[PDB]
């Protein structure tokens, strides 16, 4: 299963090509991989958070 998605149609901080944006709802809560990079990707839900597990 998926512990949480926290999407609400908003990611925390998806930073690519040297610029940090806010979209695509790529929020995860698990230590499967890239936890160090998961800190950077996550840790900034500017807007509201809605958790709807996908049971993946």
């Amino acid at each position: 299963e998926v512990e949480g998605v926290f999407v609400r149609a908003t990611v925390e901080r998806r930073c690519r090509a040297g610029f940090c944006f806010d979209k695509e709802g790529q929020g995860f809560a698990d230590g499967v991989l890239s936890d160090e990079q998961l800190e950077a990707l996550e840790s900034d839900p500017l807007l509201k958070v809605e958790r709807c597990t996908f049971s993946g």
Binding site: G4, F6, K48, V49, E50, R51
Partner: protein, 44 residues
């Protein structure tokens, strides 16, 4: 290296600070809010 030689002796000092509001603590530890509604008991 961005140093700043300063006299700090005149009536005013450089880079003067402006304290508007103190560090009032903001908390979200009660079911009152929608963070615990929409999420698994997330306090802030």
């Amino acid at each position: 290296f961005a140093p700043a030689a300063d006299p700090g002796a005149a009536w005013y000092l450089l880079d003067t600070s402006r304290s508007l509001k103190p560090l009032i603590y903001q908390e979200r530890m009660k079911p009152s809010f929608t963070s615990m509604t929409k999420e698994d008991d997330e306090q802030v």
